[PDB]
Design an enzyme around this catalytic site. Structure first.
Site, short mmCIF file in Angstrom:
data_model
loop_
_atom_site.label_atom_id
_atom_site.label_comp_id
_atom_site.label_asym_id
_atom_site.label_seq_id
_atom_site.Cartn_x
_atom_site.Cartn_y
_atom_site.Cartn_z
CG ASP A 20 -39.73 -7.77 -110.25
OD1 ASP A 20 -40.30 -6.82 -110.83
OD2 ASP A 20 -40.25 -8.90 -110.14
CG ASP A 34 -43.23 -5.06 -113.02
OD1 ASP A 34 -42.01 -5.22 -112.81
OD2 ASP A 34 -44.00 -5.99 -113.33
C1 CS5 Z 1 -36.88 -7.35 -117.77
C2 CS5 Z 1 -36.09 -7.76 -119.01
C3 CS5 Z 1 -36.97 -8.18 -120.19
N1 CS5 Z 1 -38.21 -8.81 -119.75
C4 CS5 Z 1 -38.15 -10.19 -119.29
C5 CS5 Z 1 -37.46 -11.03 -120.35
C6 CS5 Z 1 -38.17 -10.91 -121.70
C7 CS5 Z 1 -39.36 -8.05 -119.81
O1 CS5 Z 1 -39.32 -6.89 -120.22
C8 CS5 Z 1 -40.63 -8.68 -119.36
C9 CS5 Z 1 -41.71 -8.83 -120.28
C10 CS5 Z 1 -42.94 -9.42 -119.86
C11 CS5 Z 1 -44.05 -9.57 -120.82
C12 CS5 Z 1 -43.10 -9.87 -118.51
C13 CS5 Z 1 -42.01 -9.72 -117.59
C14 CS5 Z 1 -42.15 -10.18 -116.21
O2 CS5 Z 1 -42.93 -11.08 -115.87
N2 CS5 Z 1 -41.36 -9.55 -115.30
C15 CS5 Z 1 -41.48 -10.01 -113.91
C16 CS5 Z 1 -40.09 -10.23 -113.30
C17 CS5 Z 1 -39.24 -10.99 -114.28
C18 CS5 Z 1 -39.59 -12.32 -114.66
C19 CS5 Z 1 -38.78 -13.04 -115.59
F1 CS5 Z 1 -39.11 -14.28 -115.95
C20 CS5 Z 1 -37.62 -12.43 -116.13
C21 CS5 Z 1 -37.26 -11.11 -115.75
F2 CS5 Z 1 -36.17 -10.54 -116.27
C22 CS5 Z 1 -38.07 -10.39 -114.83
C23 CS5 Z 1 -42.32 -9.04 -113.04
O3 CS5 Z 1 -42.22 -9.48 -111.68
C24 CS5 Z 1 -43.81 -9.05 -113.47
N3 CS5 Z 1 -44.62 -8.35 -112.45
C25 CS5 Z 1 -46.07 -8.65 -112.57
C26 CS5 Z 1 -46.40 -10.11 -112.34
C27 CS5 Z 1 -47.14 -10.84 -113.32
C28 CS5 Z 1 -47.45 -12.22 -113.11
C29 CS5 Z 1 -47.03 -12.87 -111.91
C30 CS5 Z 1 -46.29 -12.14 -110.93
O4 CS5 Z 1 -45.88 -12.80 -109.77
C31 CS5 Z 1 -45.41 -11.89 -108.78
C32 CS5 Z 1 -45.98 -10.76 -111.14
C33 CS5 Z 1 -40.78 -9.13 -118.01
#
Ligand code: CS5
Length: 395
Positions: A41, A237
């Protein structure tokens, strides 16, 4: 001409997964080593792993079984855009089987509670936040993994990612045996891309922030104040599936993409990225969907370059609810309230170089991007672009 050599064979093809569930690399923690699959990530900065039983986990970090485990007597909370977890801080020895041959002591958040974090069937038990300390929780004093890696060894302060989308659905068995790409730690492997590498400045060292200065849909200028494109920020990202765009940019982009694909009518659910659309096996009308070009600030003053993605990138392969023989997909672009997010969707079409040492990010056409006989993804430059600094957003 001159054929380009791949010099990191040991790290090539070390990734698995898919855009919808994330790409992961195998790691080990503790003594003796405990093997775990870790989500790569570039969107976060915490190294965390499941450390207690969970419905979606087949394994987890067992601190009591590690002789090198060190308890930081500190709790930690990390909320993402969607999904969150609570854990206990500590340090321990960490290695990457298919990476540089080194072992380093890094911080590890032992996940004890989580909500909508782990994904059923993803096959990963933790996450690797590759971004900077500024966005690490609880605060910037918790040194990110890659920082520990660089400070403790001779590995160059740089990593590169090749995320490989299959171009079609992968069932559970298939996604487990399939090669999902490469994470080259400490270098650039030339066999992973074609053409040249173009670098865009990392604006600020927190998320991997970049500046978009122009957007086109089939060569047609979306024609918006470039500042809109980066409201309130633009990041690369890998921890997010879709290309996420600021509300206004999303509305404009969707309207333009619909206009370009007007010979075919799609339901609202499709455009909301909620429902899939299907076509008879092999008949997906790729040609009616436009390519999308994102112009990025270059390293030379007044100069920019562009990356062009195909619908093979922004349309994500999904299995039909009836597992039929149709080729089905979902619109992998959605609106954001937190700026532009260049997710896995976009990354799959390119070899992305996170050049930490030179504070820049490079893009090159991926040797594994999905395309057709008529069009290909592209990375082209240079273009004369003025007042690009104005494209960046300030609170
Ligand atoms: C990846 C597989 C499918 N997923 C997740 C499951 C629906 C997405 O496409 C998705 C969708 C959204 C809409 C947000 C994030 C999201 O928050 N991703 C995270 C990591 C992640 C989290 C999770 F819970 C599950 C995962 F698989 C991956 C990133 O670090 C966001 N970067 C910006 C950010 C934004 C706010 C705070 C922050 O702190 C560093 C960083 C991920």
């Amino acid at each position: 001409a001159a054929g380009r050599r791949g010099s990191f064979v040991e790290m090539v093809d070390n990734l698995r997964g898919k855009s919808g569930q994330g790409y992961y690399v195998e790691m080990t923690v503790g003594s003796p080593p405990q093997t775990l699959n870790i989500l790569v990530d570039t969107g976060s900065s915490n190294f965390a792993v499941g450390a207690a039983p969970h419905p979606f986990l087949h394994r987890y970090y067992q601190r009591q079984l590690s002789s090198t485990y060190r308890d930081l007597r500190k709790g930690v909370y990390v909320p993402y855009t969607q999904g969150k977890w609570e854990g206990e801080l500590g340090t321990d020895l960490v290695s990457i089987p298919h990476g540089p041959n080194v072992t380093v002591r890094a911080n590890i958040a032992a996940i004890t509670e989580s909500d909508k974090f782990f994904i059923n069937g993803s096959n990963w038990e933790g996450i690797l936040g590759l971004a900077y300390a500024e966005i690490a929780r609880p605060d910037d004093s918790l040194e990110p993994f890659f920082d520990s890696l660089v400070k403790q060894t001779h590995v160059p302060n740089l990593f590169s990612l090749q995320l490989c989308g299959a171009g079609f659905p992968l069932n559970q068995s298939e996604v487990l045996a399939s090669v999902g790409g490469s994470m080259i730690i400490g270098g650039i492997d030339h066999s992973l891309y074609t053409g040249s590498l173009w670098y865009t400045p990392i604006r600020r060292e927190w998320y991997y922030e970049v500046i978009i200065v122009r957007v086109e849909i089939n060569g047609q200028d979306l024609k918006m104040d470039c500042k809109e494109y980066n409201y309130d920020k633009s990041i690369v990202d890998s921890g997010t599936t879709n290309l996420r765009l600021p509300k206004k940019v999303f509305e404009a982009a969707v309207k333009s993409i619909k206009a370009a694909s007007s010979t075919e009518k799609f339901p609202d659910g499709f455009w909301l990225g909620e429902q899939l659309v299907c076509w008879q096996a092999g008949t997906t009308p790729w040609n009616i969907f436009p390519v999308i070009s994102l112009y990025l600030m270059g390293e030379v003053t007044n100069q920019s370059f562009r990356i062009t993605i195909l619908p093979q990138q922004y349309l994500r392969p999904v299995e039909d609810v009836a597992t039929s023989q149709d080729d089905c997909y979902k619109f992998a672009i959605s609106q954001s309230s937190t700026g532009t997010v260049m997710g896995a969707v976009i990354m799959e079409g390119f070899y992305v170089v996170f050049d930490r040492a030179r504070k820049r990010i490079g893009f090159a056409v991926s040797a594994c991007h999905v395309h057709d006989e008529f069009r290909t993804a592209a990375v082209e430059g240079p273009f004369v672009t003025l007042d690009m600094e104005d494209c960046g957003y300030n609170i």
